[PDB]
Each structure stands twice: as C-alpha cells, then as structure tokens.
Amino acid sequence: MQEHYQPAAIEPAAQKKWDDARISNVSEDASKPKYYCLSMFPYPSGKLHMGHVRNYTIGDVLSRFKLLNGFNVMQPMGWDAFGMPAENAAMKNNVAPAAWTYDNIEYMKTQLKSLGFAVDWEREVATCKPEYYRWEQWLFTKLFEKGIVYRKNGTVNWDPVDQTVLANEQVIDGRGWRSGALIEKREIPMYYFKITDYAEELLNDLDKLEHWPEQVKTMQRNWIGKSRGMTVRFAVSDDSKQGLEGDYAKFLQVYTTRPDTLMGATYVAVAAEHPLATAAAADKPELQAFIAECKAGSVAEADMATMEKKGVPTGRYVVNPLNGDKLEVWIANYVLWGYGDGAVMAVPAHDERDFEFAAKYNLPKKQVIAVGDNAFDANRWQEWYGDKENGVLVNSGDLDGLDFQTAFDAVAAKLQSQGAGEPKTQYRLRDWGISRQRYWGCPIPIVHCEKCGNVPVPADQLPVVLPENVVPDGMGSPLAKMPEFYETSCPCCGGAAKRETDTMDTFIESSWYFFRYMSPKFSDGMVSAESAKYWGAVDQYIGGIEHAILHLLYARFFTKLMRDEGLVNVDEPFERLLTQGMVVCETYYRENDKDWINPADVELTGRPVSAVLKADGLPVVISGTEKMSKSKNNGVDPQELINAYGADTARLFMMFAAPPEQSLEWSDSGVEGAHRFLRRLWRTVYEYLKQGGAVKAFAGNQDGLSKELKDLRHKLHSTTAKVSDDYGRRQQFNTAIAAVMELLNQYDKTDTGSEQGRAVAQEVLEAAVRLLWPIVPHICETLWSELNGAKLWEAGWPTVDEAALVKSEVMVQVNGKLADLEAAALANIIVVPGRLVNIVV
Ligand SMILES: CC(C)C[C@H](N)C(=O)NS(=O)(=O)OC[C@H]1OC[C@@H](CCCn2cc(-c3ccccc3)nn2)[C@H](O)[C@@H]1O
Ligand SMILES: [Mg+2]
Ligand SMILES: [Zn+2]
Numbered sequence: 001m002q003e004h005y006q007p008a009a010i011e012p013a014a015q016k017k018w019d020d021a022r023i024s025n026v027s028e029d030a031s032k033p034k035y036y037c038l039s040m041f042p043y044p045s046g047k048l049h050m051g052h053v054r055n056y057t058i059g060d061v062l063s064r065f066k067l068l069n070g071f072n073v074m075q076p077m078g079w080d081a082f083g084m085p086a087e088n089a090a091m092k093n094n095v096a097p098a099a100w101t102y103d104n105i106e107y108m109k110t111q112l113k114s115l116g117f118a119v120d121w122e123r124e125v126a127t128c129k130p131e132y133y134r135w136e137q138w139l140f141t142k143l144f145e146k147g148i149v150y151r152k153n154g155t156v157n158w159d160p161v162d163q164t165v166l167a168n169e170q171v172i173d174g175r176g177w178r179s180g181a182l183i184e185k186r187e188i189p190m191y192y193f194k195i196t197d198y199a200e201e202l203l204n205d206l207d208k209l210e211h212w213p214e215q216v217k218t219m220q221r222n223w224i225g226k227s228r229g230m231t232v233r234f235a236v237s238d239d240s241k242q243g244l245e246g247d248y249a250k251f252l253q254v255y256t257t258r259p260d261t262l263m264g265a266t267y268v269a270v271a272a273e274h275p276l277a278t279a280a281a282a283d284k285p286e287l288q289a290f291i292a293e294c295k296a297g298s299v300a301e302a303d304m305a306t307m308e309k310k311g312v313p314t315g316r317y318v319v320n321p322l323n324g325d326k327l328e329v330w331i332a333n334y335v336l337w338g339y340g341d342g343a344v345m346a347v348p349a350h351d352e353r354d355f356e357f358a359a360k361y362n363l364p365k366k367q368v369i370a371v372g373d374n375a376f377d378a379n380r381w382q383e384w385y386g387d388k389e390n391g392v393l394v395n396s397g398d399l400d401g402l403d404f405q406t407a408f409d410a411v412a413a414k415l416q417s418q419g420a421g422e423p424k425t426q427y428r429l430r431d432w433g434i435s436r437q438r439y440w441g442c443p444i445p446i447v448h449c450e451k452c453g454n455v456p457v458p459a460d461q462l463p464v465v466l467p468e469n470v471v472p473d474g475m476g477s478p479l480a481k482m483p484e485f486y487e488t489s490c491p492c493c494g495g496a497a498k499r500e501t502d503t504m505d506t507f508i509e510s511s512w513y514f515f516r517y518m519s520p521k522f523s524d525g526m527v528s529a530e531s532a533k534y535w536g537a538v539d540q541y542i543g544g545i546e547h548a549i550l551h552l553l554y555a556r557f558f559t560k561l562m563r564d565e566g567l568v569n570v571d572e573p574f575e576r577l578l579t580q581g582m583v584v585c586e587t588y589y590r591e592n593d594k595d596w597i598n599p600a601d602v603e604l605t606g607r608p609v610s611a612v613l614k615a616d617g618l619p620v621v622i623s624g625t626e627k628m629s630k631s632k633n634n635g636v637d638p639q640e641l642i643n644a645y646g647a648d649t650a651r652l653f654m655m656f657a658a659p660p661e662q663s664l665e666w667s668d669s670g671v672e673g674a675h676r677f678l679r680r681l682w683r684t685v686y687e688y689l690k691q692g693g694a695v696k697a698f699a700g701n702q703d704g705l706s707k708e709l710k711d712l713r714h715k716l717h718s719t720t721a722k723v724s725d726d727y728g729r730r731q732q733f734n735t736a737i738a739a740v741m742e743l744l745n746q747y748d749k750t751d752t753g754s755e756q757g758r759a760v761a762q763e764v765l766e767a768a769v770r771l772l773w774p775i776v777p778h779i780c781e782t783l784w785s786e787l788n789g790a791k792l793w794e795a796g797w798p799t800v801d802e803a804a805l806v807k808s809e810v811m812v813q814v815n816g817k818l819a820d821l822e823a824a825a826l827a828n829i830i831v832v833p834g835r836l837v838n839i840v841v
Pocket of ligand 2: 210
C-alpha cells in the first residue's frame with residue numbers, strides 16, 4: 001500500500017476491476033430481487049455540468065447501496081438527443097446536428113465513465129437513432145387509428161423574419177425574442193394527444209404514489225385542474241338581443257364552481273371572441289380595439305395570473321335565473337375562449353379576482369356568504385370571503401342558512417327544474433400538441449394523399465428515417481425544403497403523396513425511455529414482454545424539480561397508454577421520486593466600454609478581501625450568487641474538478657455540501673475539505689496496516705472487552721444503523737457522511753493497540769469503507785482490498801450488531817434492612833463495591 005493517496009492511480013484501476021467483473025451489466029435474473037434506479041438522462045449538449053454530476057452521483061449512491069444489499073440493480077444511462085440545441089449549434093458551426101450530437105455523446109460518455117458511475121452501458125440508448133424512435137412512430141400510428149392521436153387546426157405564433165414558429169415564452173411584447181418583429185397568429189393543422197381522455201385516471205392515480213413528494217402531487221393536481229361545478233344559463237334581456245343568432249340570442253351560458261354564490265353575482269364577463277362581444281362591439285370602436293388587443297395577446301400559463309385583468313362594459317344585459325336581477329355583460333381579458341363556454345359570472349364578494357376587478361371599476365359587491373360573526377368589509381378583502389367549508393348562505397332568500405354542499409344541490413335543483421342549468425365537471429388540462437416545425441426531431445409517420453387523406457405509415461415501413469445529412473440554414477424548417485424526403489407514394493393507393501414534414505415534441509422520447517432500457521435491442525416491439533414483466537416499474541427516480549409537471553405527467557400518460565396497448569403491466573412508471581436542488585455559484589465580471597468571467601479563471605485575495613484574474617492579475621469585481629448558467633458565465637466545469645482532485649473528491653463534495661433537495665453552493669474551500677477527508681481516510685487505514693497488518697475483524701460476544709472498546713463498537717453499530725437509515729429512508733447523504741466522520745473521530749481517541757484493540761479497529765475500518773463505498777467507491781474499493789481479501793460487493797452492506805447497542809443491579813437498604821451507586825441510590829452511607837449500598841441514617 002502506497003503511503004499517499006493518489007486518485008489518478010487508483011480510480012482507473014477500480015473502474016477496470018468493476019468493468020471486468022461486469023457488476024453493472026445486469027440481466028433478467030429472477031434469482032436476485034430486482035431494483036431499478038433511474039436518473040433523468042441528459043441532453044448531449046457537449047460536456048457534463050455540475051447539475052449532471054450531482055444528479056448521477058445521487059443516483060449512483062442509491063444504486064451502490066442497493067447493490068451492497070444484494071439487489072439486482074439496473075442503473076441505465078442514455079441520451080435525450082433530439083431538440084433545438086443541436087439545430088442552433090448546427091447553424092452557428094455549419095455542422096450536421098447528428099454529427100454534432102454523436103460527438104457530444106462520445107465525449108460525455110467518457111466523462112460519466114471517469115466518474116465511476118455503476119452504469120449498465122450495454123443498455124445505452126440514443127433517442128435520435130432510428131432503432132429508438134421507430135417505436136414511438138409505431139405507437140403514434142396505433143393511437144392515430146384509435147383516435148387518441150388526431151389532426152386538427154391550431155393557432156401558433158409565426159415569426160415572419162426568422163421564418164419559424166415561436167412559443168408564448170419566446171414572445172416579448174408581441175415580438176419575436178431574437179428577431180424583434182411582430183409575430184402573426186396563424187391557424188395551421190397540427191397533431192394532438194387526447195390526454196384529456198385520461199385526465200381522471202391521471203388525477204386519481206396520484207393517490208397511489210405514497211413515496212412521491214406532496215408538492216409534486218399537488219402541482220400535478222393543479223395542472224389537471226379538475227373542478228366540480230355548475231353550468232348556468234342567463235337569459236339575454238329583451239333589449240340586448242340585437243345581432244345575436246341561435247342560442248346566443250336566447251341565453252348566455254357560463255360555468256361556475258361556486259353556484260352557492262349565484263345570488264351574489266353582480267355582473268358577467270365574456271371572452272373577446274364571444275358572440276355577445278362581437279354583436280356589442282359592432283358599432284363601438286373602443287370595444288373593437290379591446291377585442292383586438294385581447295386577440296393579439298400571447299400570455300404563458302405561468303404568467304396568466306400575474307397579468308393585469310382589464311375589461312370593458314358592453315351595454316348588453318342578461319338575467320340571473322335565481323333572483324331576476326339584470327346584470328351587465330363585460331368583455332374581459334382573463335376569460336379564455338376554449339375554456340368552458342368562454343363566459344363566467346363574477347361574485348366580487350367571495351372571489352378575490354372578482355373583488356379586485358370590481359374594485360377597479362367600482363362594480364357592486366354583494367355578500368351572500370358568512371363565516372362566523374366575522375364582519376364583512378366591502379373595501380378590504382379578507383381570506384374568509386372565499387371560504388367554502390365553514391361558511392353559510394345569507395342574503396340568498398330561501399337558500400339562507402345552508403352550507404356549501406347543500407346549497408350546491410339546492411341551486412342545482414332550482415336550475416334543472418326550470419331548465420336554467422345543470423351540474424358539470426370540467427378540467428383545466430388541454431390536449432397535448434406534439435407537432436413541431438423543426439428538423440432535428442422524430443418524423444411524424446403520416447403521408448398526405450389527396451385521395452386517401454392523412455394516412456399512417458404501415459408498421460412494415462417504419463421507421464420513417466430522418467435524413468442526417470442536413471445542415472439547417474435559417475429560412476424555415478429544412479424538411480419542407482427537401483422534396484427528396486417528402487415526395488413519396490401513398491401506402492394505401494400507390495399514388496403521388498407527401499410525407500408530413502413536422503417532427504414530434506421532444507417530450508415524447510423521454511415519456512417512455514425508461515421502458516426501452518428494459519430491452520433496448522428488442523426489434524419486435526417497444527419493450528419485450530419478458531423484460532417488462534421482470535423489471536416492472538422504476539423503483540427510484542431522480543431528477544430536477546423543473547420536470548415535476550410536464551415530463552412526469554407525460555411519462556405517466558404514456559405508461560397508461562402502453563399498458564392499455566398490452567405492452568406493460570404497471571399503472572405508474574415511478575415508485576419513489578427524489579428531486580434534486582440547483583447548483584449555484586458566485587458571479588464575476590469586469591466592465592466594458594459587462595462581460596462575465598468564469599470562476600475557474602479567477603483567483604481571490606488572513607481574511608479574503610477581493611478577487612483578481614488568474615491570467616492577468618489586475619482586480620475583478622465580485623457579484624451575487626445564483627444558479628450556474630451561460631448567462632453570467634458562473635458555471636464551474638466539472639472536468640477541471642476531476643483533473644485537479646479526482647472523481648471521488650467531486651462525488652464527496654456534492655453529497656456532503658447539501659442535502660439533495662437543498663440548493664448546493666459551490667465552494668473552493670468545501671472542495672478542498674472533501675479532498676482532505678479522503679487523504680485522512682487513506683492515512684487512517686495506512687497507519688493501521690503499517691503497525692501489524694490486517695487481522696480478523698472482531699465478531700460476536702463482546703463480554704470481556706474493555707469499556708473503551710465496547711464504547712467504540714457501540715459507536716460503530718450506531719453509525720451503521722444511522723447511515724443505513726440515511727441512505728434507504730431519509731435519502732440525506734450529508735448526515736451519513738458526518739456520522740462516519742464521528743466514528744473516525746472516536747476511533748482516533750481510542751487506544752486500539754492491544755490484540756482485542758486491533759480486532760475492533762479492523763471491524764471499524766471494514767465497516768467505514770463499506771459505509772462510504774456508495775459515495776466514494778474508488779478509494780473504498782482500494783482500501784477494502786488492503787484490509788480484506790473478499791470481494792467488497794460480496795461482503796455486503798454492514799450489519800448492525802444489536803448486542804453492541806446494549807449497555808451494562810444492586811440492592812439498597814435503609815438502616816440495615818431492605819460515589820457511582822450512591823448518586824442513584826439516594827434517588828430511590830457506605831457502599832460495598834458493586835453489590836450493596838446502605839443508607840446510614
Ligand atoms: C427526462 C428528461 C426530460 C430530462 C432532460 N433530458 C434533461 O433535463 N436533461 S439535462 O441534461 O438538462 O439534465 C439531466 C438531469 O440531470 C441534471 C438536472 C439539472 C437541473 C438542475 N441544475 C442545473 C444546473 C446547472 C449546473 C451547471 C451549469 C448549468 C446548469 N444546476 N442544477 C436535470 O434536471 C436532469 O435531472
Ligand atoms: Mg401501497
Ligand atoms: Zn392514396
């Protein structure tokens with residue numbers, strides 16, 4: 001054993017030893033119990049970043065822990081390869097997105113390998129390969145024939161200068177983010193998943209996920225946004241029917257989740273596209289401009305509530321079917337055509353949004369609910385205004401005194417009896433639009449024939465291969481400019497036809513890759529039936545919180561789709577869900593005629609004062625801490641951390657600095673501290689072996705050990721129990737590291753020089769290297785080989801010796817008849833050592 005710890009010598013050797021033993025190349029061995037630990041696979045952007053390293057270290061800690069406990073562990077990795085990064089990198093560098101992608105995959109693969117992740121590389125997948133995406137094209141065609149995938153016209157934001165379609169998040173004040181030109185709303189045909197047909201299943205199945213964070217479940221329930229409410233029809237007043245046709249001349253229908261407050265509606269509001277708005281604005285230019293400004297909007301859903309609510313009165317009136325009151329119709333910008341009936345009632349007394357709207361325009365507020373003896377104030381909003389469970393109706397006529405649910409049913413009865421409304425269930429969830437006007441994505445397996453219509457490609461002809469010999473320019477989607485791709489024969493009639501040129505939303509590939517890992521070379525289906533039956537579902541899933549809504553809902557949706565196709569036997573893809581925090585770092589710049597400088601290119605000025613540039617030496621200015629990004633150039637390249645300290649130090653620093661959910665602050669001092677602990681770990685074993693070498697670890701009956709060695713064995717088996725619970729239950733690895741640190745501290749203060757002392761020392765070290773192996777496997781594998789000849793993974797996870805956790809009875813008489821023992825005896829004077837104590841009073 002070499003005296004000093006050198007990661008560059010031991011890490012490649014350990015990886016070679018793990019690869020040769022093929023410990024991570026697992027099969028459907030029904031002898032060992034299966035465990036499927038999955039981290040979210042990355043985009044092949046070029047290099048690993050520290051977010052990657054944190055995620056895949058967390059995934060590897062859990063995997064190695066379960067491996068040491070005798071599980072058949074699958075930890076697969078792969079590449080989420082389609083998407084815009086490759087297309088933009090293609091435009092900037094004049095390279096094909098495929099070539100750029102495969103280069104990144106090779107570089108990042110070697111980086112992941114140098115980090116020591118116990119990955120089954122034989123199960124590797126790349127979603128941009130035809131052997132992957134042929135199967136989502138296949139599922140597409142099956143769902144398309146069933147109607148779960150349909151084609152319908154939709155509205156998109158078109159940029160006329162950049163010649164591409166933009167998302168709402170990419171539109172700034174009506175203009176494209178890069179071009180700066182006014183976007184144009186255009187109606188074009190697109191494809192959709194009917195995810196709304198699975199809404200009730202997606203919502204209810206969330207209750208099965210007892211090992212999911214409650215906030216993720218809450219966020220998904222709110223996204224689906226189911227509501228049990230009431231359809232209500234307000235008769236149009238006889239003076240307000242000018243210009244309306246059909247049922248819009250008869251009534252204005254709205255949806256409401258608060259029918260118990262119908263007595264308190266003081267106005268109604270319609271969408272800009274509602275026929276009432278059209279007929280009212282017919283002679284009023286102000287309303288026409290308000291309708292136009294509404295249509296021109298491009299508000300993202302994460303900003304719909306932050307949008308200022310504006311409205312204009314129309315001069316039209318409707319009648320409340322419960323109290324006869326005449327109510328004015330307003331055009332409002334928060335009423336969305338396509339949600340419900342595109343019309344809502346407003347109760348400013350018991351809905352906060354209605355309260356602010358009515359306060360802006362001085363519209364009436366009528367209290368109809370009371371909660372306790374609370375005073376109602378028509379000028380200040382109070383939280384109890386919106387109370388449903390605790391309130392009781394007032395000012396509501398014969399409905400006074402009822403709670404929410406009995407008022408709901410009573411209003412439903414009155415409405416249904418006179419035909420004015422009925423109960424209705426609604427969902428905020430929209431159907432999933434998957435068409436993309438991009439090149440670097442999975443082609444849509446539809447052929448357009450003017451005789452046969454939209455024809456799905458036959459299963460024999462799949463895949464539709466995306467041609468990789470393409471360098472996107474910058475004047476529209478390249479596939480629509482390639483007749484060599486889109487000119488084809490109809491597979492129903494043989495006539496001239498045109499392939500679909502739009503590609504699929506890249507969320508589709510990540511909605512099922514966890515099943516493809518089960519059988520990634522299966523040529524006869526998405527996943528082989530024997531593999532899906534053995535691996536079942538993912539036991540542990542790790543990834544960032546930014547994917548808690550869309551990706552997770554998509555993955556759950558796809559699982560139920562594949563289940564209903566007969567491909568899988570699970571309702572839910574992920575059993576346990578751990579979400580990792582962000583990585584943040586200080587920022588630095590130097591002013592321009594700012595240009596942010598990377599932290600690794602900077603040294604800082606015993607107390608730290610200021611910072612300077614490394615190459616030069618003249619000062620730089622230090623800014624605030626925030627998430628690592630290209631925006632402020634504060635991303636710390638993990639490769640430089642590997643090169644400076646080794647992979648074990650990188651893995652230790654990220655697991656010790658913060659719990660997985662908390663944000664991790666980059667610290668040069670912290671990284672050095674982790675490296676010093678590994679040096680200490682190395683020195684502890686080395687010094688131990690140099691005074692005697694290895695012995696048989698202490699085992700069994702510890703009666704006869706000294707108190708100091710009994711206390712060290714108590715610390716050992718308490719640390720083993722603590723660490724085991726931090727890995728398996730709390731998933732809090734920083735405290736597990738601290739606990740091993742405390743075990744080593746007590747070991748250091750214990751004289752382990754005797755024969756029984758060496759045996760307890762051997763036991764302590766053999767446990768501490770196995771306890772740390774999931775976090776720092778390279779140095780622990782090396783240290784274990786010097787301590788013990790058995791294979792580390794076959795020695796197994798350390799067991800807790802309950803006998804070491806037990807601590808080590810005298811009589812006490814008063815006046816004859818029934819230091820250490822005197823203190824407790826007086827809590828019930830000469831003391832015979834160990835047997836009797838006598839109270840001499
Ligand atoms: C399942 C699919 C949809 C996953 C998708 N391919 C993806 O997100 N691919 S990805 O390649 O972007 O990330 C793969 C995977 O590991 C990293 C996690 C990082 C997020 C938090 N973060 C980022 C940073 C950071 C640090 C330095 C520089 C820049 C940024 N610091 N902290 C992801 O959430 C995900 O779990
Ligand atoms: Mg259960
Ligand atoms: Zn045809």
